[PDB]
Write a protein that binds this ligand. Sequence first.
Ligand SMILES: Cc1cc2nc3c(=O)[nH]c(=O)nc-3n(C[C@H](O)[C@H](O)[C@H](O)COP(=O)(O)OP(=O)(O)OC[C@H]3O[C@@H](n4cnc5c(N)ncnc54)[C@H](O)[C@@H]3O)c2cc1C
Ligand SMILES: NC(=O)c1ccc[n+]([C@@H]2O[C@H](COP(=O)([O-])OP(=O)(O)OC[C@H]3O[C@@H](n4cnc5c(N)ncnc54)[C@H](OP(=O)(O)O)[C@@H]3O)[C@@H](O)[C@H]2O)c1
Length: 524
Amino acid sequence: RRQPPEEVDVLVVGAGFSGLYALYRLRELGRSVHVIETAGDVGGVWYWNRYPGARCDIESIEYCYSFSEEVLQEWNWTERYASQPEILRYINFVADKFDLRSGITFHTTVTAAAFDEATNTWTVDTNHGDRIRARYLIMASGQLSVPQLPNFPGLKDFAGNLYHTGNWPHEPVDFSGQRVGVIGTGSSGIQVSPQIAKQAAELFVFQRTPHFAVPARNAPLDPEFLADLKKRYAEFREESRNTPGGTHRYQGPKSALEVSDEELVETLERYWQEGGPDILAAYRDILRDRDANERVAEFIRNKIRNTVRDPEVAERLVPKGYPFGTKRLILEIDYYEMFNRDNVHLVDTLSAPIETITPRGVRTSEREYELDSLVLATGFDALTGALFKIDIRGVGNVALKEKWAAGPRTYLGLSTAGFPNLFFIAGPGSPFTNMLVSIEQHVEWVTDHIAYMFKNGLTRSEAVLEKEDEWVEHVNEIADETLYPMTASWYTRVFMLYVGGFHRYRQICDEVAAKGYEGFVLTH
Ligand SMILES: Cc1cc2nc3c(=O)[nH]c(=O)nc-3n(C[C@H](O)[C@H](O)[C@H](O)COP(=O)(O)OP(=O)(O)OC[C@H]3O[C@@H](n4cnc5c(N)ncnc54)[C@H](O)[C@@H]3O)c2cc1C
Ligand SMILES: NC(=O)c1ccc[n+]([C@@H]2O[C@H](COP(=O)([O-])OP(=O)(O)OC[C@H]3O[C@@H](n4cnc5c(N)ncnc54)[C@H](OP(=O)(O)O)[C@@H]3O)[C@@H](O)[C@H]2O)c1
């Protein structure tokens, strides 16, 4: 185990995409920097989430680093949407190339962080009893990094094999001949289930809220196409950085409501056949007008009923009541087709809720299911989850958990008043988008600022209370013009993610920096 140093200019928490780039860039800026990571190796979500079928919902050519021209040119994606093992190889490739592991302490969990106003330094403690003093602390601790604690009664009494998708075994699990249950029909459950169906004697899928999901239409990435792209990657990447989604995606000019029924079909069928999440932009108002939303939502509801041959199964799979695409659109590869199989059973817990786990399996209010294995695809804590497991204390020894008790309040999503020299990467108040575009922007902003602090001899950077309030207000106002607040997931009041688009978000941050970091108080 690599032991962390006693002092460093910057301490990073987390060794996924975000923390690795921060480590990379601070080295390039001539700053001392070190990374603390719980996991045994690099990767973050792509180290932990090793379940069969784990796959990205952003195209390979967009979900990737761009800071290295060498990496863009030497690496070769294989599919439209990269599988978890490929991406982890990608990340491992970059870590080897840039010798990043020499600045990471693995197997170690930051447990406390307290700011010393007298030394303008953070004292950072871990479960191994390390104590690290760093001028700045970067939290690259993720948004989907803490598996939600499934709190079913009787869970400990389950006789069989228990698995969670967010912490899958590092050796492949053979489900052949078994009765297997999957609890959760979000992205992880929609991804892992069709893999397990290929092996299990019987699969039971326990669904509570049904969610929208459209075909991935995954495919091999044509080498020639890729070799053409590599000749223009930097320009292609700048194009992505000038979109709302941080990805190439057609912006439909037509309102969903000003079109004939037959056109709406033909147009949506194009997207349904082409696959991917781009259908979200099919018409300009899908996320701004409920009637428009519904019109698009009914098209997809009918695609479900037309895929599932049992009308009773099909309609339990149809999402109703909540707007389409207000929750990040799931892509599915043969998930709906899966229920046409003899060995697959959809279990509607809204109809009959889970009363307890038993030695033998799962007991709903109406019957008991005997299972050899139980797979929990039950999601993660709120994006505040990883930070909230750390005892973070700022000015006046106030805890971060107390300050974010009624929602995570920040300035720009990067810092919060009363906690100086503390930055959050791809965290609350930041933009929802292609996380690699957003991570790169965030890491460059944060480390640029740290470089500015050192160049000018300043040692304390702190967001101004009033600007933080102003930002929460602004984030709330943008979202309110949207269907997003209609989905409770965006609160933990503080609407959690900026929905004004990556491009508008980058422009805001750039102008803050060009104006001497307006809204931060910088002192020595
Ligand atoms: C299966 C899956 C698919 C996804 N697909 C997409 C997609 O298609 N598009 C997209 O935009 N996003 C996607 N995401 C979101 C994903 O989180 C981001 O794309 C990106 O990987 C986040 O990188 P990160 O380094 O900021 O966070 P993470 O990858 O979560 O890294 C955080 C790291 O910090 C570590 N850590 C946390 N707390 C501590 C602590 N106290 N001490 C030490 N270490 C700590 C964790 O162990 C973890 O390794 C997906 C996520 C998952 C799980
Ligand atoms: N690229 C990809 O394909 C991919 C893969 C994984 C994750 N992601 C992203 O990362 C995030 C996490 O996705 P996720 O699927 O793992 O979690 P999730 O989206 O929050 O869904 C969790 C599922 O488990 C169910 N569940 C949770 N607790 C339950 C309980 N006590 N009883 C019954 N059912 C319960 C939920 O039902 P309810 O809906 O009723 O609560 C839900 O269906 C998502 O935002 C997703 O976009 C993307």
